[PDB]
Subunit: 120 residues, 8 copies
């Protein structure tokens, strides 16, 4: 359907399987897509018929910076969960969590996880 | 299924939910996609069989710069409506309205809404 | 479903509806995607079972630099037709022809047309 | 389904059709996507229910840097084969092998092959 | 001394030696640097002791979009003159005028002229 | 002399001369250069013969995010002061405070002020 | 002194110490700066008092694409010699010759040489 | 005062003050500039009158990848020392060592040290 995007949110977090990651921290990034009907928000100009994109950013910050998991998968799942419980008007969401500076000896732009979740 | 694109059109507008936004203004960007047959134009080299991409740009500039709305949803909706009302070869259009510098305390590249519309 | 890409070919050409464009010339860019089965070439390391990507580039250059049309729709249509006429191991092709510096008073990345063609 | 990405891995390799390439070498890039169910791991935060992204990188480094093929097609096919053969959890994978600096006289960003492999 | 920068101003103008350029127009970009003492301004937080950078932008926009010359040298010379004319607190200014899309058959980022002017 | 750089620090602040800026806030960026003798630290590998670049970051963070000024001039001047006050080993520093999204109707990359300070 | 720039000219040449490079070729880039008084050209709007930047581009294209040297140093030297031989008004020039894809096993952006030559 | 540049060399290394860094490793980038006379090499096209930039890269790889220091200062000093010890023709060199992903909780592009050395 229609979509709200938040591109390239950047947080400093302490996620990781290695304990050294858990105390040093590192950049994390998230690309958020939520699907919902925006027709009537665009015709009414009434934010209350949509989802305040600023709250969606806050929801992500809460998971990435105020929680510590081992896997980036858990970052994605928890963000997707929090979105669907709090915003009923959202039907599906696609969350991409990016680790641009992983502890991999090599040369690459980033590693990331991407999930899509909707309502049973 | 053929497409005309206008990538990363940039405008200075005064849309926004917060009154302080309506006074200062800020950057807005629009990615435009329209769908229509281009095979006939391509074989004849006759612009009458397509749509002048310069008119599509002017249509977007007038919604973004000559109007003021609370929501970016309204920018996308008005662009889509004007395109489908004005252009008779276009069966569908996707409009992405980007707010690269929204007033959200945090770190990110941009927020955006994207809609797809066709005529009933 | 296997694909060969050529990203962001750049040429200088003289296409355009305005006679002034046909005199001055300008930059043109092309994104090429051709679909074909590549497993046979992959498991045999034999180029005879694939398509030499250098020949694809030369095909695009000839249409863009050795010809002059008025519409960019005509560039794409002529590249796609020449692709399918020359290699019927290619089942499909998507041609994006980009005009990064058109004569439009405004601010934008570029305008482009994109087409997908297959044999009837 | 859900996805693990490894973006823009960079290697120096000696693949190529021309013997001159086989001893000079050049850059090669790989974009890796694998598809699997990440719901388990997201719930449990246990890496045994996912695929260690470091192992996927090492798999790609072996094919690109430790061996020499004539075609990029062969690089992608061998990465895909090695991936699907070592992980039952992965249902599909897409491998894009980029040659950024091929010996094509002209102007472009890169050439690439992209394949998608599931289980026959 | 201290400096105020305006990076990568973008305008659309009709400058050029060829009549075709004067008709079609093209992008122009300006980089502006002006030198003056900013200590007292940073000590007092009082704009009366500096130069409103927004007036410096309008000054450059007026020369590039409200005037038309044959040469980019004249754009730079007229910006520098207007600056020293209107803002006596500026000791020196460096104007860089960029023509990114000139009618030159070839491949390049841009051509530019850069001048430095001072109070006699 | 030898230099320590911090490139492109990004903060969210509420500086600006318009009260609407003090309410909404906007991105702020800082480029930091300090000059000092680094030979000893180089030969000894001892941080105590240098300056912790993390302390320099935190020093810049307070000025930008924990205070509100009308002029970016004040930001730059207060960072340079705190550096020279607290790090006797530093003989000179250059502070570039960047405003990427100012409320200027137009198109540009950023505005910035840059200063250089040493001890009298 | 006043400056004319040509940024990031891109050519395809066959320069190289290794004979394999002379057969395959590769990308070459050039950044050009020339110094001369531009203020009479800026005041009269007459190109007779400046240097046609399109002539400068062709001069570099001639050295990079119409000849084959072993070293990038010879490319830089011959460009500079040709500029100072033809344009008496040019008192100094800086030539940067860039090999972005040298046959060096490793990871990097480019290697380059840069010379400055001035008039007797 | 001619120059050889090597831009944006990328290595994976284990330098750092914190033991956690010595275990995980991270990216390190180096910008090298060496100053010498290139006229003789440019006139003769004879590599023996310059310095093979391939050796300079290897010299830099040695220090970043085959060694571990606490400070990036020590990386820079050792690259400079080995350059001036090994190459008589080089009269001066400037080394910038970049840490793009340091363990600093914040948002920035990179930290770096830069030294210039010549023979006393
Ligand atoms: N799929 C996946 N693989 C990993 C992950 C992770 O979070 N997800 N984290 C690692 C280093 O912390 C090790 N490899
Ligand atoms: N969906 C949506 N959310 C918002 C929007 C908006 O335009 N659309 N604008 C905001 C501040 O102007 C607040 N959040
Ligand atoms: N769809 C389309 N529109 C145009 C085109 C064109 O090639 N295609 N050319 C123009 C300027 O040459 C302006 N308008
Ligand atoms: N499809 C394809 N075409 C090519 C390839 C290649 O690997 N695949 N390599 C070449 C130069 O080495 C020549 N052209
Ligand atoms: N130095 C200089 N050379 C040019 C210029 C110009 O403005 N300055 N413009 C041209 C095409 O309009 C032709 N070449
Ligand atoms: N020199 C300078 N000029 C300005 C500044 C500023 O901080 N410094 N801020 C403005 C908008 O807040 C208006 N113009
Ligand atoms: N200074 C310098 N060194 C080199 C050069 C070169 O042109 N200049 N060419 C090489 C590969 O052709 C490798 N080494
Ligand atoms: N000047 C300097 N400061 C530091 C350095 C360093 O290498 N150089 N390393 C640190 C973390 O390893 C933090 N502080």
């Amino acid at each position: 359907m229609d979509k709200i995007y938040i591109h390239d949110m950047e947080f400093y977090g302490y996620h990781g399987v290695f304990p050294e990651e858990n105390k040093l921290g590192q950049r994390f990034k998230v690309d958020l897509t939520v699907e919902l009907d925006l027709k009537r928000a665009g015709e009414s100009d009434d934010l209350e018929h949509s989802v305040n994109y600023g709250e969606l950013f806050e929801l992500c910050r809460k998971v990435v910076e105020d929680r510590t998991y081992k896997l980036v998968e858990s970052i994605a799942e928890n963000i997707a969960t929090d979105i669907l419980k709090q915003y009923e008007s959202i039907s599906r969401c696609t969350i991409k969590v990016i680790k641009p500076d992983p502890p991999i000896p090599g040369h690459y732009r980033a590693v990331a996880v991407e999930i899509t979740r909707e309502r049973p």
